[PDB]
């Protein structure tokens, strides 16, 4: 099955979701990467308040989420500070 | 800005003295009898015809098609300043050759050409050429001025 851009504009193959290249005008094909300029990254932050951050702050070396999940391949190790 | 805080040329005594020398016949002349060609430079004495002050011209052709002109007093009472630490190296030189001569002139060739330097003895003057094309002249308006160190 393919993936439909959330705004409804376009449809892309399944393997272009989170493939580190921006294929969707609303950025909805890259929820887990820094590839889209207008995307967002969801931080569950169990034990605190969930948070959305800019896609440009995924793997930027800076700890943006208390659970540390925005930094998963950057060389910065973020400790969990949600308490 | 408060301009009166800063000297104009007329308020700078050495600038006033120098700038009052207007284009004309230079009193400096090169003593071709003192000419010496060396490993790195041509040196020749210069003299002020009125004051008889003796200067030394050190003329060098450099690698990468540059010329260096240095002029200092022949027998100074105290050493004059030479700017240190700005040049990253002692610039590599090219050999100078006398390739022409008359009573009032020496033509020098930088390495094997095409750059040539014509030293005129009286009045002192330098002309820089690529082959036969004049690139630039030195002291052509006769404005060279060198205040020697007095007592």
């Amino acid at each position: 099955k393919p993936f439909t851009c959330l705004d409804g504009t376009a449809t892309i193959p399944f393997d272009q979701v989170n493939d580190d290249y921006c294929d969707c005008k609303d950025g909805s094909d890259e929820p887990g990467t820094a590839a889209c300029p207008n995307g967002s990254f969801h931080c569950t932050n169990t034990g605190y308040k969930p948070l959305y951050i800019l896609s440009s702050r995924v793997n930027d070396g800076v700890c943006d989420c208390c659970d540390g999940t925005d930094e998963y391949n950057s060389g910065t190790v973020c400790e969990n500070t949600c308490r | 800005v408060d301009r009166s805080n800063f000297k104009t040329c007329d308020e700078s005594s050495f600038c006033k003295r120098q700038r009052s020398i207007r284009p004309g016949l230079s009193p400096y002349r090169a003593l071709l009898d003192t000419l010496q060609l060396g490993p790195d430079a041509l040196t020749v004495h210069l003299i002020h015809e009125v004051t008889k002050v003796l200067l030394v011209l050190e003329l060098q052709g450099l690698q990468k098609d540059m010329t260096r002109i240095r002029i200092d007093e022949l027998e100074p009472r105290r050493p004059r300043y030479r700017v240190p630490d700005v040049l990253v190296a002692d610039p590599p030189t090219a050999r100078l050759s006398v390739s022409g001569r008359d009573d009032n002139s020496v033509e020098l060739t930088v390495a094997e050409g095409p750059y040539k330097i014509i030293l005129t003895a009286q009045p002192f003057r330098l002309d820089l050429l690529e082959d036969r094309s004049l690139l630039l002249s030195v002291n052509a308006r006769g404005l060279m001025a060198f205040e020697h160190q007095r007592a």
Binding site: - | N5, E11, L136, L143, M144, Q149, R150
Partner: protein, 105 residues
């Protein structure tokens, strides 16, 4: 002012007297010259015949103004000459207060 010299309230004992040096250069075929910062002035340097020479003397000028040859904070005594046919440069290696006159023929 050739030896002991005063400007406003400040005195220069000038123990070594007049020691200034100067030399002129002619650039046949060149109508445009550039360089010798720092001046709040146009890129193409102006003729100085009717006014002040360009001054090279690192100075702190409070609220400096535009289009004039007063010396500002830095001094690079290097002048570039450009024409359709050639480019030349003059590098005047001197660390003392320096004035530069520019004239056309």
């Amino acid at each position: 002012g050739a030896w002991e010299e005063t400007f406003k309230t400040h005195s220069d004992s000038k123990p070594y007297g007049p020691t200034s040096v100067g030399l002129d250069f002619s650039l046949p075929g060149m109508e445009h010259v550039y360089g010798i910062p720092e001046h709040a002035d146009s890129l193409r340097l102006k003729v100085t015949e009717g006014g002040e020479p360009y001054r090279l003397y690192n100075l702190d000028v409070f609220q400096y103004e535009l289009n004039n040859p007063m010396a500002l904070y830095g001094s690079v005594p290097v002048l570039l000459a450009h024409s359709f046919h050639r480019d030349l440069g003059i590098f005047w290696l001197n660390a003392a207060e320096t004035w530069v006159d520019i004239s056309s023929n």
